[PDB]
Design a protein around this nucleic acid. Sequence first.
RNA 1: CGGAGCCUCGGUUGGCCUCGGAUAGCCGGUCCCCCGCCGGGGUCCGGUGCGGAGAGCCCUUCGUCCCGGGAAACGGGGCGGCCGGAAAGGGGGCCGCCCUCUCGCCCGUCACGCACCGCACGUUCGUGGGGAACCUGGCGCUAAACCAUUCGUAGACGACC
RNA 2: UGGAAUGCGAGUGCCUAGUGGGCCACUUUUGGUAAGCAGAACUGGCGCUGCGGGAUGAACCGAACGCCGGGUUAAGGCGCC
Lengths: 109, 138, 176, 135, 148, 50, 199
Amino acid sequence: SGRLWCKAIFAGYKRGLRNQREHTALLKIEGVYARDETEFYLGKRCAYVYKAKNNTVTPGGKPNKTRVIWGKVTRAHGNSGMVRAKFRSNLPAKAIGHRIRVMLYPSRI
Amino acid sequence: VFRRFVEVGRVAYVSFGPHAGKLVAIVDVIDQNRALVDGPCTRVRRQAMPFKCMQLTDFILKFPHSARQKYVRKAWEKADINTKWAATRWAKKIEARERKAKMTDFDRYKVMKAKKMRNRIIKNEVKKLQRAALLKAS
Amino acid sequence: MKASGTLREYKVVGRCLPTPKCRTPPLYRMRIFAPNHVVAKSRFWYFVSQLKKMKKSSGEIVYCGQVFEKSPLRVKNFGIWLRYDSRSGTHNMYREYRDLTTAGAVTQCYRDMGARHRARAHSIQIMKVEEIAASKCRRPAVKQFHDSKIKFPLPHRVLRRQHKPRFTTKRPNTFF
Amino acid sequence: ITPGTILIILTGRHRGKRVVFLKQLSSGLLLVTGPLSLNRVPLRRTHQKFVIATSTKIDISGVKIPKHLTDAYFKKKKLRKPEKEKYEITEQRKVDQKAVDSQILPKIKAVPQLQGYLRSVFALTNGVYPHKLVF
Amino acid sequence: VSPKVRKVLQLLRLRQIFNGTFVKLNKASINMLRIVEPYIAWGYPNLKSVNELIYKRGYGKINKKRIALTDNTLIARSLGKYNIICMEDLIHEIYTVGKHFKEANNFLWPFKLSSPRGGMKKKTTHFVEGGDAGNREDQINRLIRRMN
Amino acid sequence: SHRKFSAPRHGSLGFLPRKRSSRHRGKVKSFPKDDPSKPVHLTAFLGYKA
Amino acid sequence: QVLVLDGRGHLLGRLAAIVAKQVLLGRKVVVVRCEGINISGNFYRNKLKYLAFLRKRMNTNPSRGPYHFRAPSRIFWRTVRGMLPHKTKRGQAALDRLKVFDGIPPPYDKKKRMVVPAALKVVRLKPTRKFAYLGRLAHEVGWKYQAVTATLEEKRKEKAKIHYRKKKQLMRLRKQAEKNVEKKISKFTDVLKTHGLLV
RNA sequence: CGGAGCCUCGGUUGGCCUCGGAUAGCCGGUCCCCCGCCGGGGUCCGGUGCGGAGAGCCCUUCGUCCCGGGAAACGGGGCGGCCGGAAAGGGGGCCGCCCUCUCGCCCGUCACGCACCGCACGUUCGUGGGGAACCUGGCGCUAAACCAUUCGUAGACGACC
RNA sequence: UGGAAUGCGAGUGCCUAGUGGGCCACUUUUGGUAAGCAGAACUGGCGCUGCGGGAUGAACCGAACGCCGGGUUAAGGCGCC
Ligand SMILES: [Mg+2]
Ligand SMILES: [Mg+2]
Ligand SMILES: [Mg+2]
Ligand SMILES: [Mg+2]
Ligand SMILES: [Mg+2]
Ligand SMILES: [Mg+2]
Ligand SMILES: [Mg+2]
Ligand SMILES: [Mg+2]
Ligand SMILES: [Mg+2]
Ligand SMILES: [Mg+2]
Ligand SMILES: [Mg+2]
Ligand SMILES: [Mg+2]
Ligand SMILES: [Mg+2]
Ligand SMILES: [Mg+2]
């Protein structure tokens, strides 16, 4: 057993300087520091995993305090390897600067 | 202090650009920033190339400045710069860099096993040497 | 005119439109250095208009075509005669450059005239471009490269890959 | 993904294990075997979108896969709950596992250290980035 | 927009940004384009540009409505009296400027083109100055590829 | 406008705040700088105002 | 977990911009030897820049700010704060992820220090240009612990040298050990060479 | 100092235990020669697009069983002591011990484990931080502060002596 | 052979509110030393108008607005904010 996701940071939302589009998040992925290396990650699942006070169900498991918002990498962003991600619900702004899992599926390799 | 010089015949390793990883010979110096280089035996057309994308090697060919390609190719073969380059530690380090880059997942597993046993054998030997060093002082 | 990218050399031939008085007007030819042919044609009309009672309406372009460098693998010295408008007058200049192509030497002139005299390309008129033998070149910057045994090192090489890695354990070396 | 390729399962209880690809079923799901003795993955279906196909391939061209290992063979069988009902490994499945394992397993052991490779479980570690490495 | 430019842009049917039309050139029309010079990019299209402009973005003005040209019967019912019965006849009447260029061309609704992918240089100055306005001749085709 | 005739300001701004001392016993803010060459000695003492 | 940077030979404003962007991405950062930092431009014109900063003060109550910290670490700390949205909860959390030090106190003195080549003076300045030292700058605008920080730094480097000679000796034995067991590890060495891990 | 759980708060999903530094220069060996309280300088030998490389290194985990071949034997695990650390101090190493196993590592043989029938929050840091309690044994501790009263070195009242 | 091009459906009649302090910019321009001054022409604006950019701003630059998803742009930008 071991890790099976890549470490990404929730850098922020899509925005100009005075307008913020919260339906799209900008992810900084560890080791991806150019636009030419982001190709592997496009379309990959993304999981914002967090914990809450109340228990919740678990697929193939018993209830616990872990919750997740799913998403996926939709496209690259800029020249330094950021990717745009969309989630089934907009990420809460308390999640800026925290971990966003990037899975290794759907696999194209 | 300096040892390697930009001069007619100096063989330079191209580090980045369209011809990265290849050897060229400085055929002429255009100005402060560019040189006319040639790669007859390494697949580089005679062209202008900035010094920034060059790293000087220790090899110097002997041909006149601006001598046409027939003679840059001729001097390259006489000196066998191709086998001399692959004999340098510099070439081997480049080779070691890409052998590692192409390691398949199974290969990585086999290195992790081999490294595991090699490291233990060396460590156990290092321990014995240290103990013997204790007796000599004592 | 904008000196965008590397300029090209164009051969532009034009004439007055034929009329009953002069059914066969003479053909005028100019050397035009421009980004693209559309700009090349426009500049042609800007120059012949200065030298002849001619403009686009009363004349036509007979031929526009790039002039390829004849010895692109040879190193040459180019003398450029140009006039340009400064903030307080017009001045004729003569400048020298080393290149492989004549158009490359003219492009060096536009960057150079912009750098040293804050001259925008709309105020520069290249009058003449001549390849010059090493013995006739005047500018010491060009002449110092006329040394069959030229040799020089590359001191204090500055690390240009400064963000790969962005954080490193070892300080860069500048001596090679 | 060609027959004999070593795949990496990315999902399910078997995530991370390295299996041997046999064939693509008519429904398009992949048929793989652990083998059971090396990593405890039986003849099992899996989606190609959830496997990383490595460059490690074994030659199983001479392996005879039973014609009856089809999609309906692996389809889950409903279990009623009125307490709980548990899954029982049918005796046929065990016989089937040996038929395929007894051929592929000796072919695994022809490649040195391959069996140890298929015993180990894939994982990401410090400084290891998928976009950089070759599988 | 100044009153004289605003009228000329309406006669060309370019009432919106990145709208496109074909214009057959002559002393009358070339001088109109000079008036609206700062407001238009124009040039000479090639056979491929006429093709792709009319196939991807070709809409007919049928009974004063914008109907996509999804069938040949659409062209034949309106321009059939001029022997124009298919998209290929329409492309030939446009590209070669036939005797019925006017009818076939007014039938085509002004092409609604997207923003130029890859950006512009400078929409506020002429093409020959390094901008985008005015006549760029055959270079219009490069623009059409990125906007169509 | 400027004040007509000049005059030095009243009081020193160097003794602010003009508040009640937080300590009753005088505190030695700075002891004399130690000179190692000198023999060991004390540098302060407490007396009462008779 | 933590990113420990060494302040010697870095240009003040360039390190802060990089350090500011790291803490805004949620990364803890420690910068040591903030007195070793450099600023481009001769020393006198850098001194003048700070002395002008010292003149800024609320005319009616100087105790209300600005606060003119004299320690090199706090100067650098205030410079990183200048590049953050420090009046929002988000930027204050980022500012808590930064620790700045004069000298190298424990536990970072026994840990490896990274450098930022994009802020290094050797990389970013022309060799002829003049530059200042944040330490001398700090010492001459009221900083009071230049000598003690250097005196303690002298002790640290002395110990580090002892540790290093211990490390060089362990390397000599490693090379000698590899020769002794060269026979037993030949097969394992080949695997490493075949895949580039040994050259 | 040494058992179960109950809440609550979270983020995290291997570790790098360190020369000083130069950058028109470096690094490592060599101490045969010169100085010092093993360290420094010289000579010489090697590297220098840093390979004694952070482009790096270390650790690497499916578990068990059976018998082999390499590796170890100066070995792994585990109760008592002496140096050692102060800028914001070390669950490192060293010596004993009575114990404790020849398995830990590498390549093979041998087969087995819920093989849960394609599917998510999996995998650590985790005896995490904080709050209540319930137990359960060992060794210990039995104070101040504020009010009130008094003083006047103090004082609008608080405060202060 | 509806006699240039281009574009567009036109014509016509009653009843009619608010307004009748304006102000600004390119260019032209009168008075004045000049003025964020007073007075004109043309066009376009603000007024009545949000929106991206010019840190900030009636007018500048871009572009004008039904409630949305995707893509691409303008003017402007890309050390960190
Ligand atoms: Mg794009
Ligand atoms: Mg304008
Ligand atoms: Mg006075
Ligand atoms: Mg003070
Ligand atoms: Mg967790
Ligand atoms: Mg009124
Ligand atoms: Mg006025
Ligand atoms: Mg007025
Ligand atoms: Mg009003
Ligand atoms: Mg209006
Ligand atoms: Mg508006
Ligand atoms: Mg402004
Ligand atoms: Mg949109
Ligand atoms: Mg900005």
